[PDB]
Amino acid sequence: PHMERASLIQKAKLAEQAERYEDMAAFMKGAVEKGEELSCEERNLLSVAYKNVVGGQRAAWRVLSSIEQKSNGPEVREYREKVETELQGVCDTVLGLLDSHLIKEAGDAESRVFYLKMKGDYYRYLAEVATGDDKKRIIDSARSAYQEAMDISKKEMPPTNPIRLGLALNFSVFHYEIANSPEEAISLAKTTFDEAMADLHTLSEDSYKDSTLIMQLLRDNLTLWTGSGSLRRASAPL
Amino acid sequence: PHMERASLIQKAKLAEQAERYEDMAAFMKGAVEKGEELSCEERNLLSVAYKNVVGGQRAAWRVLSSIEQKSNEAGPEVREYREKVETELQGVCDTVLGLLDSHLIKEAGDAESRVFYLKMKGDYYRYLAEVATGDDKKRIIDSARSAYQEAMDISKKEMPPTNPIRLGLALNFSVFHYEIANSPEEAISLAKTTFDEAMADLHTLSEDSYKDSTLIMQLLRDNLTLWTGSGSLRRASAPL
Amino acid sequence: GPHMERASLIQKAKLAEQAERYEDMAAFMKGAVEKGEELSCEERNLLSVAYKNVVGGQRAAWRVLSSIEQKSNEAAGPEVREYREKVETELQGVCDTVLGLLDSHLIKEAGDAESRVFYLKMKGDYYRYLAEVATGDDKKRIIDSARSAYQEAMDISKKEMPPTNPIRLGLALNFSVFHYEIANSPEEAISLAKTTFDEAMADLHTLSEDSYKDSTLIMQLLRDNLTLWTGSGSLRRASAPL
Amino acid sequence: PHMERASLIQKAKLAEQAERYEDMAAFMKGAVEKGEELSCEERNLLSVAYKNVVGGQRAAWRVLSSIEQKSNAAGPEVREYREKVETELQGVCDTVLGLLDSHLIKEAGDAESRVFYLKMKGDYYRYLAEVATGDDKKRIIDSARSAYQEAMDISKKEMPPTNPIRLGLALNFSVFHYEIANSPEEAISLAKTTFDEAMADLHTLSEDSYKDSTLIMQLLRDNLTLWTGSGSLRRASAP
Lengths: 238, 240, 242, 239
Description:
The structure is a homotetramer.
Chain A: H1 3-17, H2 21-33, H3 40-70, H4 75-102, H5 109-129, H6 135-156, H7 162-178, H8 182-198, H9 208-226
Helix pairs in contact in A: 1-2, 1-3, 2-3, 3-4, 3-5, 4-5, 5-6, 5-7, 6-7, 7-8, 7-9, 8-9
PDB class: signaling protein
Keywords: 14-3-3 proteins, Protein chimera, phosphopeptide-binding, signaling protein
Assembly: tetrameric
């Protein structure tokens, strides 16, 4: 390690505690640029930082795009465009770090799934706002990243692993919202849930909370997408 | 025919594998009547047997009551047959409640067994309440409430929030609040509390209860989404 | 032109609020103030909301970092100090921006009592935020600048506004916080807080339905602080009066 | 002496103004035993009289029980005197519960009066629970809970969420949950639900109605901060 890198990682941990996500992101970018492999803890810092930064831009873009769609003055279009351009710049930064530093085709496989999933996520966020001729390319870039990640996770991780579950949840969202394949989405989400449910006896104690949380999100999306809400209430199985 | 306790339990296990729930129920009733306590495995056999028997009667009653409710817009066969299924269902609930009161419920044995039976008492009074329309309805609802309340009091002092009997109990009592007692707010807030307290204590869970606890936590979340109208909400992506 | 620009900026600040984009909202509201016209009651609230949210996050961060830094001085590690200093400098820059707008545009050009009190209260607030982080020889000056702004605002609000007015209540609540946390006058704070609450409670019959929610919300914050500061929160639970 | 019903009600109003609660209680017990329903104003006089009488006994019992618990044999005077106060308190609760069961609950016509008395029955069983110790405590706790639950069921169907008897009932049943039944979570949930459902319909009230209800909503908020520990949080500044 570089010690600049060690100091930047320490400052990213301080920025997380302080809920200063743009600083956290800047510190984690700097750390990625000052070294090779990130540890599991350091990969999560990078992801949390940029998740929170784009999360707010995406939430804003949705509000503005919703106002623009209903009002159809030039201020809404212009401001929606400002937020959109800013969001695109963050996604380009994350995708640049992944391609130039983090994604290693001959590296550790588990870390390769995390980054390839992250590459699919940030191309998917670009696809959420893309309306040009470039849209098809963006959608395909996200699909390839997720497909490459899915292929590795199936060979290398158990079906209860939270990175593998997270990956399948996000790729099903991609199918539903982006690729307009709601049936593939429902299918993948049901398969992921059922394969993880069958392998619950081999769930390690540390993965328990993260895996069951993501399995709940899969079940929540399945209910939303199939219209399984309004069905009869459940009582205990025993 | 070997109808000694050990043989009735063995036949109850065969009946389960064969999906012969009325035989299972009869074998388990017979095993309870030897005047002895049930193990955790044996309590589950008793519950599975009667849950399957009463479940088919309830499902049938709902179909018939639904046909009877639409029909008035009427031959007497629907009312008569709905009444036949109701009476039969009431007899099973009375059998289960009789076994619980005369043999199984004690003050006291171990907390998990006490809670299990009191939860079972609230469940079978709740099934009687589902079909009750007379002056006796209030009494039935109160009998279900007391059983669940006594069970809730023991489970809070004696069991961890992730225990599946404690989770199952809270899930069923929240259903009782929503459907039977017409207290949808109490139901939502019990379901949310149960889920949140179990979610915080997930580190202290075993391989045995893993599947049972997370399955019941999923049912709590499913009911919360149905009852709060949270279905409509934005799709989830990974927290990662 | 500037008149169409001013209108666009205020409209974008309303969009930025809906989108929870407070730094943009602040920038749009600064730009609108720099058109040199007075702000309406609605526009004053947009300005205040924008900068309250911006500085709110910086202050919350500063408190976390200062708390981590204080626990390391009892084997760190200069990163906490350095990062706490970064957040503080950034916070100071926002307070200086707000205080500059108030002094150069808003306070000098305020017509009515409600707008004049609003801005003087805001001046007291942002000097109080500078006082929250100040440890130099400049500390005493900052505290006094805050006190004078609040005192001038209190003098106008007592002559010109009813005791239920939410700007007057907000002012009193913040000046009591200044007394408790900044000036180390917890008795003056409890006093002021109790007096403000009691005088507003007596004049509740003369409250409009518009200001009822804003006034009762601020009266709730006054009694919440009174409970915290007097330790009355530890008292026996209430049951029904009949 | 003028001991006709209306004069007993007039004398109870005078005893309230004079803070003579044992006389007030005796005047309202006397008016109840005339065999007519109590009006809304009259029900409040009955409740105020006995809440003040039992309140002083409860406050005393708490002081004495605290001295007896701390005295750690000692002198027997504390136990004996705590027992005297306890027996006296139990007698007042038995008097109120006897009036409710023999005259007021049976004869109540409307929902508001039915709820009022059932809430009052839960309260006085809760006061008996405060001084009971073992399996005696079980018995009493469940009489309190049933009275409260029956009252809650009627108030939800028959009264708006801003009604002060419905608010008072929820506040007391939440106290029962927290202190007596050891269910701090449903106490906190019931109090927040009650506050939030009442706050959503406050615009409908007059100034008198608004005052009565907002006082009980403040007590719900006060208990919520005590029970959730929200009072120890960072001080508020203006929004």
